[PDB]
Design a protein around this ligand. Sequence first.
Ligand SMILES: NC[C@H]1O[C@H](O[C@H]2[C@H](O)[C@@H](O[C@H]3O[C@H](CO)[C@@H](O)[C@H](N)[C@H]3OP(=O)(O)OC[C@H]3O[C@@H](n4cnc5c(N)ncnc54)[C@H](O)[C@@H]3O)[C@H](N)C[C@@H]2N)[C@H](N)C[C@@H]1O
Ligand SMILES: [Mn+2]
Ligand SMILES: [Mn+2]
Length: 174
Amino acid sequence: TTQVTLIHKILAAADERNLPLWIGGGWAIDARLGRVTRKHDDIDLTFPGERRGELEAIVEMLGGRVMEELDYGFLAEIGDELLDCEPAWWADEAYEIAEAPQGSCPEAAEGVIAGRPVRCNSWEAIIWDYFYYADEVPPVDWPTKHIESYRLACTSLGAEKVEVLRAAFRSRYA
Ligand SMILES: NC[C@H]1O[C@H](O[C@H]2[C@H](O)[C@@H](O[C@H]3O[C@H](CO)[C@@H](O)[C@H](N)[C@H]3OP(=O)(O)OC[C@H]3O[C@@H](n4cnc5c(N)ncnc54)[C@H](O)[C@@H]3O)[C@H](N)C[C@@H]2N)[C@H](N)C[C@@H]1O
Ligand SMILES: [Mn+2]
Ligand SMILES: [Mn+2]
């Protein structure tokens, strides 16, 4: 419950600032499912890129700190819990993660974590990051927890749609 408690505190502080934040990765899967499916190593977040200072402020207020600057964002820590944070940028009608499919950061809260509505990245954005993962790390070297979470996300979106998205990913990076 430590992680869930932390997620709730982070989102509460963000709500208070009218700061949208999207849960990502494994917690986004569990949020859209509305069920906790397994243990999650970190908490993945997407934030408005131009309001990064506000997220850092939340981290600090909760007793944490920025730990690392990453190629795609930053890592912060609160207690022993890691926050893996990626910016999204305003694109006329929504925030969008760089290089990701349109609709990556939906405005509506489309998931639930322990009764609490949460904004979360789209299924397409979630699966897109598995495609990257497959290029950066061969799948038969993936830890099994990611093999399984990928299959779950695919079953939720649907194999027909995943096939088309994967083809688009290949074409993009052809
Ligand atoms: N939007 C553009 C970026 O998209 C991707 O970047 C991911 C990043 O990999 C991802 O972080 C994962 O990868 C990092 C290494 O680069 C690790 O340090 C993070 N703990 C990891 O987060 P985490 O382990 O929580 O996994 C979150 C998701 O991401 C993928 N993933 C899972 N494990 C890996 C891995 N070792 N390398 C690459 N991708 C990985 C899976 O699809 C997973 O659902 C961020 N949480 C979101 C970000 N969108 C591309 N790899 C790089 C690209 O520039
Ligand atoms: Mn991981
Ligand atoms: Mn994660």
